[PDB]
Structures are given as C-alpha cells and as structure tokens.
C-alpha cells in the first residue's frame, strides 16, 4: 500500500471482488494520508450463492401462490374483505437428482451455505439461445414475451454441467433483448440455457435419500423473498360493471357443487334439535380446472390470479 504517486499520474488499481466471504459486506477501507482528512472508501453489499442444479422434469413442478386475506361476515350473508399481503409469497416444489460430481457438490453446498439466501433460476422459464453470444458483448437478444424478466433483475446462463454458468444483472427489457451493465466474460454458443433468477431461501432442508454409493434424490422446496410484479388483467367480457369468467372448465376430473350456509346455532340438547336460518340465503360453491397448452394462456391465468388478490376481488 505505501507507494508514491508521481505528479500528474493516475494509478488505477484493480479491485477484485471474490466469491467467498461473510454474507453481509460491511467494509470500511480508509485511505489515510498526512495533512489530509481521512478519505474512507466504504464498500457495501451482500454475498449470495446461486442454485445451479437442474431438477429432472419427470414429475410436474408445482408452483404455489399464497396470500393472506382475513374476512369476517355478519349474521347476514355479507362479507368485508381485508386483503393483507399485496405481493403473494411464491413457493416452488420440485425433485432433483445428482450422480456424477453433483452429489458431492450438493452435499458441500447444503452443509456450508445451509439456510441462507440463494439465487434460484426459474426452471419453468427455460430458454435456448438462437445465436451465439460473443464474449464481452453487452445485451442478449432473446424472447421476453410473457417471461419473469424485470428491470434491474438477474439472469443466469447455464451449460451442460453445473459449473458452466454465469450471472449477470439485467437493466431493462426491450421486448427483444436484455440490456446489460456488465459485459459477459465468457462466450456460450447455441444450446446454452437461459434462466430468470429470483432470490430464494430453503424453506426446509431436503431429506436426502441414498440411491447408491454416489447418488441422492432430493425434494427441494424454495420460497422467493422478493415481490413478483406481474400485470393484472381481467377477462374482456363485462357484466353489470364486473368481470365474467368465460373459460370453460376442464371435465377430466368430475366436479361437484354445494350450497354453503351460515346454518349454525343448531342448539341440540337431549330431546330434539332445532335449526334456525340466520339469513335464509344460499351461497353456491363451484370448482374449476383448466389446461394451458401455451404461454399466452398461462400468462393470462397468472394475471387473473394476481388481479384476484385471494378472495378480495370478486367476479
């Protein structure tokens, strides 16, 4: 550190930031010189490790959207709704495998990193590059129609193996590419996978089951600790100033209906009970199922779910 500066000389050091260290970067580097007040260069940030394991797609991956809405109704069949969480918490459930060079890496990562923030790639949003990406290029031209890409987010290229990967920061979406702030330091040709990245944490440590000397199947579940912004759109049809659900439910699994009532106060003693209708109104309950078979339908369904906000918004 002690080294003279020549007059009219600018000495640009190379601040190399490693990958191993404490999670919270709380650094205060002091540039102290004689006859000058201390000029402390403060470096702040956080250290994260990305999840670089590909789960097999034999079993369907379950994505869960959960929100909180505590509703209280009076004696009459009238409901007031108090939707609590504006951004629903997203949970992912999937199964994976590890045989060659991934089992030991997975075990080490789980033992070391444990219950700490990850960088979970969005497996359902897999994407294949159409043209090779030159090393050092700024911007990845790829489809962004109905994808979990947000301005100032993260992206993670991947290769055949776990090691082949690299994470970059996306500035904005141009509807055809991903504006980047830092150039890519390694070129991957056509075939490399592109994954949107969202912060996630291990809700429960997976229970590893040994298949052979070096083989373990895990049921990993992840929860995202970042709001998932998404447009909220209702069905086009409108009736009495309200949305109308025109989608025809799938009949693959037989569905039934019921007439739920506030039929409490049965007042059963020993001789005979007697039920009184507090409101004398029946609120039907209906089930619904659907099949996407397309990106547009899935995006529309996600927008509908976000617009519903649980039980708050009716239709």
């Amino acid at each position: 550190p002690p080294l003279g500066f020549a007059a009219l000389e600018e000495r640009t050091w190379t601040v190399s930031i490693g990958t191993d260290g404490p999670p919270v970067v709380n650094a205060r580097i002091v540039w102290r010189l004689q006859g000058e007040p201390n000029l402390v260069l403060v470096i702040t940030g956080n250290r994260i490790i990305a999840w670089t394991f590909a789960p097999d797609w034999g079993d369907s991956i379950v994505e869960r959207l959960s929100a909180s809405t505590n509703i209280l109704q009076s004696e009459s069949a009238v409901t007031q709704r108090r939707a609590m969480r504006l951004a629903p918490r997203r949970e992912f459930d999937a199964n994976m495998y590890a045989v060659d060079r991934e089992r030991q890496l997975l075990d080490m990562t789980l033992f070391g990193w444990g219950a700490r923030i990850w960088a979970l790639p969005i497996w359902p949003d897999i994407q294949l590059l159409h043209q090779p990406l030159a090393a050092g290029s700024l911007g990845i031209p790829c489809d962004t129609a109905g994808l979990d890409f947000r301005d100032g987010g993260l992206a993670m290229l991947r290769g055949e193996d776990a090691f082949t990967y690299e994470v970059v920061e996306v500035k904005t979406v141009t509807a055809s590419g991903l504006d980047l702030v830092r150039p890519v330091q390694a070129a991957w040709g056509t075939g490399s996978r592109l994954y949107p990245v969202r912060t996630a944490q291990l809700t429960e440590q997976p229970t590893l089951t040994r298949l052979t000397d070096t083989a373990q199947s895990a049921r990993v579940s992840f929860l995202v600790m970042e709001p998932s912004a998404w447009p909220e759109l209702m069905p086009a049809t409108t009736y009495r100033g309200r949305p109308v659900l025109e989608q025809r439910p799938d009949e693959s699994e037989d569905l039934t209906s019921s007439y739920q009532r506030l039929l409490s106060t049965l007042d059963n003693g020993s001789a005979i009970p007697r039920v009184t209708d507090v409101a004398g109104m029946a609120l039907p309950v209906i089930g619904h199922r659907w099949i996407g078979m397309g990106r547009a339908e899935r995006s529309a369904f996600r927008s509908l779910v976000y617009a519903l906000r649980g039980q708050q918004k009716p239709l």
Binding site: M84, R85, L86
Partner: protein, 272 residues
C-alpha cells in the same frame, strides 16, 4: 378515500405506519414489504416484519398497553440495549391503505418498556399518557429543607451562568476526573448533573453522587460517557437556607421552613 376504502368491501389494503420521534430525530417504520412515502417521509421496511397486538381503550392505564413486535436488530430499540435514553421516545401510529396518500392517526404515546425475548425478535411495551396519573400528588411537606430541586420552576434559579464546559482528563469505571473542577471547594458540584450531546439536539443526563477535589463520582457508573466528548456540568443545591442564600442568593424564593415551628401546637398540655 381512507374512510371510503375502510367502508369498501373489496379495496381493503391495510398498512400500519409507526413514527418514533425524539426531538429532532425521527425513525420511520412500516409493516409492509416495501417502503411507503407519506408526507415526504419514507418508512423503511424491516426484514421480518413489524406487527402489534391491538389497541385497547378501557380507561385502565395498567391494562391498556400497546405491544410492538420487531426483530432484535431494530435501530430505535437498539438504544435501550445498554441503557435507557434519558428522554422518552414519543411514538405516533398512522393507518393508511396502499395507493392512497391519506392516513389517519390511531395511537399516540411513548416507550414504556423494551425487552428481547429471542435473538430473532424484540417486544416493546408502549404506554399512554394516562399511566402517569398513578403516582401520588401530595408534593408538599413542612420540613426544614428547601423541598425543591435546584432549577425547577419553583426555585426560579438560572443555572446557565453556572454552566461549566470541560473535557474530562481521565474516565474510570465509576469516577470521572478533571482538573478544572479541582479549583472549587469540596462538595460544590454535589447534587448536580452532567449533560452531554448524544445525537442532534438530544442530551443524556447523569446525576452526581458526590464531588471531592478533582474526582467526580457518577451514580450508576460512567458507562456510556465519551472519553473525549464535551461535557456540561451544573452545580447542586443542598437545600439549606444558608446554602441557598450564600451560594445562590435565592432566599426570597426559599420554599423551606427553617424555624417557624417544629411541634408547637395550640391545643397541647403545658406551654412551659
């Protein structure tokens, strides 16, 4: 629209805001997952969330407490970890709905107690101004001494001329020593208090057990006293009439009764 949203059956988006204020310093927190800007004030989002237990107004101060739950790393609560701040932290609670710029005031009070049951949480008990009515109100005794704290509204003595600003020479576990006070007679500062600036326009005060020569004895220890910070030290009044007039010449305002009567009734047994 706040009232309209409350009456609305489908736009309910409750969000509770807390404002901790101590003079010129304010701490803003919100219970949501994103920061909220209100009245040009942005409320930070606490990782883990901040939530209360409810508001009770039953007329009983002992029972109508307000409880706040927050992580153990909360900035405002962190101050109480070592020693309670001298001043009380006023707390104001607002209620607003996301997307609306109007908020309603719900609770107003000050910090009553703080504890850290778990490393991942902290519980704060907030008390209202009604609880300050449980202490007695006699505040009157026919004794010889002054029965008035030097500088109170009853003594009417200005302590600003007696203010002494100094930098301590050495600080120990229980004794703070300075040579400037060594020039005063023993016991000159006895009964006084030391105030110094902590942050902004807020000062922390400490009383003095005794003053002897160049050494000052601080009640409860000297922990939290900066070793090089500027300190303001005021004298103390013993309360005796001779002490009151010789030192401060405040005899006309002397609230004590030195020699009016000790026992003499007018319905006794024998006057002689």
């Amino acid at each position: 629209s706040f009232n309209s949203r409350e009456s609305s059956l489908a736009d309910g988006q409750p969000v509770r805001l807390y404002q901790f204020s101590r003079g010129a310093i304010r701490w803003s927190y919100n219970s949501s997952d994103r920061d909220i800007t209100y009245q040009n004030q942005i409320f930070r989002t606490v990782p883990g969330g901040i939530t209360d237990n409810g508001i009770i107004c039953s007329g009983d101060p002992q029972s109508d407490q307000f409880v706040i739950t927050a992580p153990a790393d909360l900035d405002v609560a962190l101050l109480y970890k070592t020693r309670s701040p001298s001043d009380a932290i006023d707390l104001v609670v607002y209620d607003m709905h996301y997307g609306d710029a109007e908020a309603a005031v719900s609770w107003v009070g000050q910090i009553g107690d703080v504890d850290w049951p778990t490393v991942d949480s902290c519980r704060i008990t907030c008390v209202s101004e009604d609880e300050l009515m449980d202490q007695p109100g006699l505040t009157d005794t026919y004794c010889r001494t002054c029965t008035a704290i030097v500088g109170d509204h009853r003594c009417k003595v200005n302590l600003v001329p007696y203010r002494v600003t100094l930098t301590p020479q050495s600080v120990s576990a229980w004794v703070i020593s300075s040579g400037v006070v060594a020039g005063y007679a023993d016991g000159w500062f006895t009964g006084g208090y030391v105030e110094w600036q902590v942050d902004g326009d807020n000062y922390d005060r400490r009383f003095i057990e005794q003053h002897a020569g160049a050494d000052l004895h601080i009640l409860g220890g000297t922990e939290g006293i900066p070793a090089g910070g500027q300190l303001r030290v005021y004298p103390g009044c013993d309360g005796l009439a001779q002490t009151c007039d010789d030192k401060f010449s405040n005899l006309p305002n002397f609230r004590g009764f030195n020699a009016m009567q000790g026992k003499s009734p007018f319905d006794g047994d024998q006057v002689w």
